[PDB]
Amino acid sequence: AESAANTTPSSHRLETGRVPALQAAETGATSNATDENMIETRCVVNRNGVLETTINHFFSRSGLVGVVNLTDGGTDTTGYATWDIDIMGFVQLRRKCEMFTYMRFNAEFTFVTTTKNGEARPYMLQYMYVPPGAPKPTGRDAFQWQTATNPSVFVKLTDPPAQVSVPFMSPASAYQWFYDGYPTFGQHPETSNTTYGLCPNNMMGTFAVRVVSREASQLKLQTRVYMKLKHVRAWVPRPIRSQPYLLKNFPNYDSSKITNSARDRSSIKQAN
């Protein structure tokens, strides 16, 4: 189906027994009433395309995913900056992604790093991908920055932004943003279930970054992560959320102060 649909010429009917406009909705099915079994239409050939509305063209946008700060002070400094990789931090890509239950794709992370007031000095950075189970680096001159059996990218600030391709690395067959269950066994409390809905097969390690130098660098960088989806497959479509997001890794909403799905009108018998 490279185009939308064509309409065949129709005419009028005056006879009993054939009722196409009485599709019962109690059956759970969608009404299959076409134009040709209704008001008299003409012959039109439609050449409008359906290529843009596909999933692969709908999820091939980058969007912002994470913002990582790097203070690099002089007396209360940290040096490194870890950031756990998750996409449920910015409600735009999350709202676009949470209209399905199970997804599977590849990523094209792009890292854009700038300075506080805005400037690009030729300082060399080091982006490190720490998988789950590998030790996290503690310090700007730690032992973990040797990057042996560990992927890393060396790029400067004046260079174009780096861009690496990340495969599908979940231990299960697909991703899922809705896990109605519990990660452990035993007795579960009733007051505060901080373990309910915790997606087990979604953790993907921690992203790290430091500045390659000896002493220090009096600068405050701020890098942004842009993740593009590709080779994506979606299952079990879910309705789109109509409530404002409130938490990072828990779908919640305000019990009072509920937002309606539509705006208000003056009267029901008025279209304006």
Partner 1 sequence: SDRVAQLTVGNSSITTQEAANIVLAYGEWPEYCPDTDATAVDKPTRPDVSVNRFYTLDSKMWQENSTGWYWKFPDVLNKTGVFGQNAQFHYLYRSGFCLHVQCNASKFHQGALLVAVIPEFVIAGRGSNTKPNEAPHPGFTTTFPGTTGATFHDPYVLDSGVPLSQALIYPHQWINLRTNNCATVIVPYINAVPFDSAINHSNFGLIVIPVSPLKYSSGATTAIPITITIAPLNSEFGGLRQAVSQ
Partner 2 sequence: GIPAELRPGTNQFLTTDDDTAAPILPGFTPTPTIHIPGEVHSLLELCRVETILEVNNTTEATGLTRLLIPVSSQNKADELCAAFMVDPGRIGPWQSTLVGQICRYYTQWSGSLKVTFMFTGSFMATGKMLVAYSPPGSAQPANRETAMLGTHVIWDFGLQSSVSLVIPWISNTHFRTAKTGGNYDYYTAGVVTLWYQTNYVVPPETPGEAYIIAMGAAQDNFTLKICKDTDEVTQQAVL
Partner 3 sequence: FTNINYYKDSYAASATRQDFTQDPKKFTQPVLDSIRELSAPLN
Q: Which residues bind a copy of itself (CB under 8 A)?
A: 61-64, 90, 92-93, 96, 112, 114-118, 120, 122-124, 146-149, 154, 156, 158, 161, 211-217, 222
Q: What is the dihedral of CA 110, 237, 179, 129, to 10 degrees?
A: -10
Report 64-83 residues binding partner 2 (CB under 8 A): none
CA distance 227 to 270: 45
User: By CB under 8 A, how many residues form the interface with partner 3?
Assistant: 27
Q: Which stretch binds partner 2 (CB under 8 A): 27-35, 70-78, 113-121, 212-220?
A: 27-35
> What is residue 21's DSSP assignment?
T
The distance of closest approach from Cβ of residue 158 to partner 2 in the complex, given in angstroms and rounded to an integer, is 10
Residues 218, 119 contacting (CB under 8 angstroms)? no
Indicate whether 18 belongs to the interface with partner 3 (CB under 8 A): yes
Counted residue by residue, the chain has a size of 272
The distance of closest approach from Cβ of residue 117 to partner 2 in the complex, given in angstroms and rounded to an integer, is 22
The distance of closest approach from Cβ of residue 157 to partner 2 in the complex, given in angstroms and rounded to an integer, is 12
- Which residues is 83 bridged to in the sheet? 207
Of 62 and 78, the one with the shorter C-beta distance to partner 2 is: 62
CA distance 65 to 109: 9
> What is residue 93's DSSP assignment?
H
The distance of closest approach from Cβ of residue 239 to partner 1 in the complex, given in angstroms and rounded to an integer, is 3
